[PDB]
Amino acid sequence: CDAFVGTWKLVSSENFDDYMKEVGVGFATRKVAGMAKPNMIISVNGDVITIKSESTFKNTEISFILGQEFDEVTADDRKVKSTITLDGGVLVHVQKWDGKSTTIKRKREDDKLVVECVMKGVTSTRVYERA
Ligand SMILES: NC(=O)c1cccc(Cn2c3c(c4cccc(C(=O)O)c42)CCCCC3)c1
Numbered sequence: 001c002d003a004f005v006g007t008w009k010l011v012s013s014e015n016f017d018d019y020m021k022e023v024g025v026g027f028a029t030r031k032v033a034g035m036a037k038p039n040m041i042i043s044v045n046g047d048v049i050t051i052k053s054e055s056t057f058k059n060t061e062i063s064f065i066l067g068q069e070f071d072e073v074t075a076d077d078r079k080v081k082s083t084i085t086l087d088g089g090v091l092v093h094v095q096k097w098d099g100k101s102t103t104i105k106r107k108r109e110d111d112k113l114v115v116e117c118v119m120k121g122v123t124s125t126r127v128y129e130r131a
Pocket residue numbers: 020023025033034036037038040053054055056057058059060074075076104115116117126
């Protein structure tokens with residue numbers, strides 16, 4: 001996937017605190033992650049895609065090949081099994097841990113990168129625009 005490539009700034013966000021709470025993120029991390037306005041800087045080299053998320057709270061990064069499950073350490077220190085695929089132009093990320101699942105989709109919409117987060121019955125939408 002490549003139409004996702006470049007540098008994106010979070011401009012809006014709904015229900016993220018609720019989403020985090022449902023994922024199991026403790027209050028202090030929720031406070032600082034919720035308040036953060038991370039840049040998401042996505043790039044691609046052959047079959048390896050790299051997504052960086054940068055903010056004063058925390059800098060993270062994942063590198064991966066579509067369809068190949070990998071170990072991820074999240075910003076909220078979960079140790080999850082991750083599996084990112086391309087499906088009808090949406091990058092679908094799945095995290096499994098403790099028999100739990102959450103799914104994160106990134107899609108390109110007009111000039112936005114739209115990220116939809118889902119845990120159990122809680123859904124969250126965040127929007128990022130080019131830097
Ligand atoms: N400070 C930062 O770098 C930062 C802040 C908020 C979210 C994120 C990334 N992120 C994270 C989660 C998540 C779910 C859907 C979309 C994003 C995103 O905007 O990339 C998410 C799980 C909760 C723990 C925080 C990491 C990063």
